[PDB]
Paper text:
Heterotrophic bacteria utilize GG phosphorylase (GGP), a member of the GH13_18 family, via a two-step process consisting of phosphorolysis and hydrolysis for GG catabolism. The crystal structure of MsGGP, akin to other proteins in the GH13_18 family, consists of four domains: A (residues 1–85, 165–290, and 347–429), B (residues 86–164), B' (residues 291–346), and C (residues 430–480). The proposed reaction mechanism for the GH13_18 family involves a double displacement reaction, forming a covalent enzyme–glucosyl intermediate.
The MsGGP–Pi crystal (C2 2 21 space group) contains three protomers (chains A, B, and C) in the asymmetric unit. High-quality density maps enable the precise modeling of MsGGP spanning residues 1 to 480, except for regions 311 to 338 and 378 to 391 in chain A, 315 to 336 and 378 to 394 in chain B, and 313 to 338 and 377 to 394 in chain C. All the three protomers in the asymmetric unit of MsGGP–Pi structure contain a phosphate molecule in the active site with a clear electron density. In chain A of the MsGGP–Pi structure, a distinct electron density corresponding to Tris is observed in the active site, occupying a position similar to that of the glucose molecule in a prior structure. Conversely, no such electron density is detected in the other two chains. Notably, the positions of the Pi ions differ significantly among the three chains. In chains B and C, the Pi ions are situated in close proximity to the glucose molecule within the active site, whereas in chain A, there is a slight deviation from the active center because of the presence of Tris occupying the active site. In chain B, Pi is stabilized by residues Asp49, Phe52, Asp190, and Phe154, forming direct hydrogen bonds with Asp49 and Asp190. In chain A of the crystal structure of MsGGP–Pi, the inactive compound Tris occupies the glucose-binding site within the enzyme's active site, whereas Pi is positioned at a site corresponding to the glycerol-binding site in the crystal structure of MsGGP–Glc–Gol. Conversely, in chains B and C of the crystal structure of MsGGP–Pi, Pi occupies the active site of the enzyme. These observations indicate that Pi likely follows a path leading to the enzyme's active center, serving as a ligand-binding pathway for substrates such as GG or other molecules.
Residue numbers in the entry:
A (entry chain A), B (entry chain A): 1 to 311, 339 to 377, 392 to 480
C (entry chain B): 1 to 314, 337 to 377, 395 to 480
């Protein structure tokens, strides 16, 4: 549908070269026919958390470039961008206005006021699903000298939005409209699970509230020509729930699943997942965040997870073994969904966030393992069979056999996990013969 | 779509009363507005395996009744019937003709000839997925006095069909056409996984062969006004694969999942499954076959399965506790899909295959627990909300909260697993008020 | 031809002093009555794997010395030397001729050509017992400019020999002849398990081919006055099969077994193993490889292996280090090793209490160490006291101690190890005076 069924690049704005212009130089020079889109990590004005505390989604942080540097991509490549639906910076225009004007501010109902709930019992606090070990409450000093408390799931420079009120949905629709006008196809919804706040609950993925919030955003997105990629790290059950509301789940189960598969030469759990895997997902191997274990619970039994845990750029977990890494990307790419490749993974780097100069990328492109990866990326991005249907094939319990078919076009992946071998056969339509991809 | 979204009765032809006429008497007397369909277990001429060795699918075994006794159901109730796609009786017209006329018989290519494969290595035999501990080869004496071997997965009176040849598909289309002409809506495909025979493979669910076989039958069924219910007992991954080819999977994960849930007062794994559960499934709690464990692998962790195993009509596994049983049916009925109720489960019986006289059923209907179950069955079969959408609600880890919505119509199930309590609230549209179902 | 029942030194040619002559000087100065033989690690022309890729077994690398420097040991000492039966260098004359002349070379059938089979199924690839994570196949560029593939289990400079053909047996009998002419008593058969290549199989320890190849090699050694020490790292069952074909297995079960015993003060599994242990084995404690787990499966239960593994990864671990550099524990392990039936080897680093190259002065220092003097006292006693030449009698003990004894007529010696306090006590019978006396170590 709306998006190109092609490889996407996950990248920062400023870590290949220095800015979006240098980024655009790198894509055109090397990746012009290997990717059909980019996920550019947060590139708005921000004041904490590596970019996830945006003052607004309506500005490019001038450090990275300008909206014209963004639109240079949005005529040839899909564009995936983060939408921080849970929270906005305390330095945002809206929150500074609440600080100035107190509860008389017209943006007051945009934030969550801990005082509405009343006294929250210990039992209700114990239900809250949060990683930090402080109460998720920031007490702020207003202009008048009063002290009120707002909900704060993350760092204190991040103020959560109020989805029992109305302003939060207007603010998001404004962001989505403007972002989509700039050429953004795909909205990665960051920390969507925390948008549901209800005392007595987990305040995380509270059902079915979470899906009504999620349905509303998707419709706003669809009116403006964009699809959604709701990102949550929890039981895969939420990935199928996302998938079944016409949104893109993450294939967060795949990376740890392949690590186990390759390290222990076992395809039983991988094949079972491919037979089940939620569809219309965006697949990753290495992210901008790293290793997440709860995403593979149930997909991989607890004993095999322990094996995996007992035995981080994705390349390092395979012990910098090129054959293993190439086979994992091969498997990822034939997995149903849109494959993302993180930029450090493209350059076979060695904590998960490195800087490259434009010379350093050209050098890294010369690496044998990287040329093998370009060959896959071009093939996955261009060969028409991937636009057809997935048919998994019978294999023994130490190998994986994956195929795609779209009319005449047919290609077949075979990975022997015992020897990390990658073999792709595809149909050259023009000659009608069966050919071996050289990678 | 084609089927009624209502409770179905799984029953034999001759175990409530003596035959299909007595069966029809029982449904009308007690179940006329509580079920929308029936799954009548094999009722064809058969010579082994409790009815799953049919001489033909074109005859009612006169012991049970006639096709007019069948059609008495197919004007008011959906009709689900077994189609033994893997094999037919050795006493069938087709196989006796092969015995008589040897390989000159025009039905010879309807069966699998072990000699085509050649010598089958030990390694290839070790791949075969079979329960019996004999080689799946029957050596038969022909009329001429020659001895040839045919493939035989089950008892020797069951001869497997050949889906590398052509006659097998004609025979099935003939069966489906005639069965559908008699009013059959739904074809339970028995032992479909064994139809794929290929040396070097498991000869069970061989992918993607199994789905092409499965797609073909579904299309034949759709031309003749019927849908399919492919029954396989293996990893749930096959249930999602079935579901994604416009066919009905079984919810074989649910029964052991509820047993664990109720016995250990834990909803975490149940809720995760409901959030994921394959859609358009047919749910059971007790079957005509009994306990199957591999259907809950992954759905329930290995440690909790051991708990379940360490701690059979479904009523007995709950220790004949009515509240627990009623709550399990309540949970089953709000689970997405078409709910089947096995007849012994309807009558709260106490190995999974009992006979009842027409008096004995009337008495069993008077049991308090059975009246509670009728109330659910009528509600699930008639209340319009189930025709809308499933929305699971937040609950603690010892309770389950399930709801359906279809316009104004809304009903909400809450089960406390600690006390086996069942509470249903629904919207009475006529008065517009919220009411409690009394059960 | 029967070997001396005495301690043997495992050592490099060039890491004590500068060369084999300095080695010989060091041996005579300190070890002349403490060892009855030497296992000199590979000293042939080689270009990979630390010496186990020999161009030929018929040359000494001129840096290390000469063949005459080797024969200087034979005459007072048994000599154990590696025979790489599985593979030879790609820079060897035989394979280099294969490079030039293709399949017209008369050395072509000496190597395994992966294309004989045709297509090898995934199921057959998955059967192969191979430790590296590439296919055991090297594709070589021929002189003609064409590309053919030969079987290659280890690094690509190591080309496996073809034991379905005949040339490999001649090549191997040739090496055995030359080695024995220089005085080699004992042939360590390196990577003996991969000699059996057969698609549809593990291509490692393939039975019963593997024993026929092993029996044949044993016979060639016997013609030329040599015995075999077939080295394989797998389930102990293979060690008893070797033992029962009149060859010397390694006691690879012992090191991990003693590590557990000392670390957990438990003699049950050690005693059970000594009661069963295969006969005519050569025992080591630290190898040139380290600690291997499949060598102790069954000998030590899976719960006790995990206990050991948990301790040691907190295996590239010199056995002295695995005992936390505890001198008493190390001496108690060497004592137990020495009373274990078989011929005990001491790796030279273990002799010198290292944690390496040494000069001749440095070895003099290492010999002065109290722990090394205790080890010398053991070695001399094991190499010279006649009771070991009789029969082994294991004694009853509690489950935290080990009681091991040997008897040969009047000669009798008795080891008692308390695993709780790492005490090593040996009492022996002084035949001439008839009294029982304590070895001072």
């Amino acid at each position: 549908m709306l998006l190109k069924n092609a490889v996407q690049l996950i990248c920062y704005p400023d870590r290949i070269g220095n800015n979006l212009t240098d980024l655009h130089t790198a894509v055109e020079k090397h990746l012009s026919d290997a990717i059909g889109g980019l996920h550019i990590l947060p590139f708005f004005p921000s004041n904490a958390d590596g970019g996830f505390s945006p003052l607004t989604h309506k500005e490019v942080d001038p450090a990275f470039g300008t909206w014209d540097d963004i639109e240079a991509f949005t005529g040839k490549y899909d564009l995936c961008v983060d939408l921080t639906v849970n929270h906005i910076s305390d330095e945002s225009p809206e929150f500074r206005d609440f600080i100035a004007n107190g509860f008389d501010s017209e943006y007051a109902d945009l934030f969550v006021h801990v005082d509405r709930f009343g006294d929250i019992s210990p039992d209700d606090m114990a239900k809250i699903h949060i990683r930090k070990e402080k109460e998720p409450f920031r007490e702020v000093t207003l202009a008048d000298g009063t002290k009120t408390r707002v909900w704060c799931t993350f760092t204190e420079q991040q103020i959560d939005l109020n989805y029992d009120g109305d302003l939060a949905y207007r603010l998001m629709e404004s962001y989505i409209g403007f972002l989509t006008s700039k050429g953004v196809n795909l909205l990665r919804l960051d920390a969507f699970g925390y948008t549901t706040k209800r005392i007595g609950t987990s305040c995380f993925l509270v059902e079915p509230e979470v899906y009504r919030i999620l349905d509303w955003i998707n419709e706003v997105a669809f009116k403006h020509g964009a699809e959604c990629l709701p990102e949550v790290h929890d039981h895969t059950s939420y990935q199928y729930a996302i998938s079944r509301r016409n949104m893109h789940p993450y294939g967060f189960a795949l990376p740890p699943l392949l690590l186990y598969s390759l390290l222990d030469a076992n395809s039983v759990y991988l094949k079972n997942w491919l037979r089940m895997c939620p569809r219309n997902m965006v697949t990753v191997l290495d992210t901008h965040d790293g290793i997440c274990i709860p995403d593979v619970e149930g997909v991989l039994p607890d004993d095999k997870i322990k094996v995996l845990i007992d035995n981080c750029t994705f390349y390092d977990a395979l012990m910098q073994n090129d054959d293993a890494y190439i086979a994992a990307r091969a498997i990822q790419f034939f997995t149903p969904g849109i494959p993302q490749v993180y930029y450090v993974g493209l350059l076979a780097g060695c904590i998960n966030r490195n800087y490259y100069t434009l010379n350093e990328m050209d050098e890294a492109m010369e690496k044998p393992v990287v040329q093998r990866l370009l060959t896959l990326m071009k093939f996955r991005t261009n060969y028409p069979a991937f636009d057809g249907h997935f048919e998994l094939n019978y294999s023994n319990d130490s190998s994986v056999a994956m195929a795609w078919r779209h009319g005449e076009h047919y290609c077949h992946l075979f990975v022997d996990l015992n020897f990390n071998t990658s073999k792709i056969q595809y149909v050259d339509v023009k000659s009608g013969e069966t050919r071996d991809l050289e990678f």
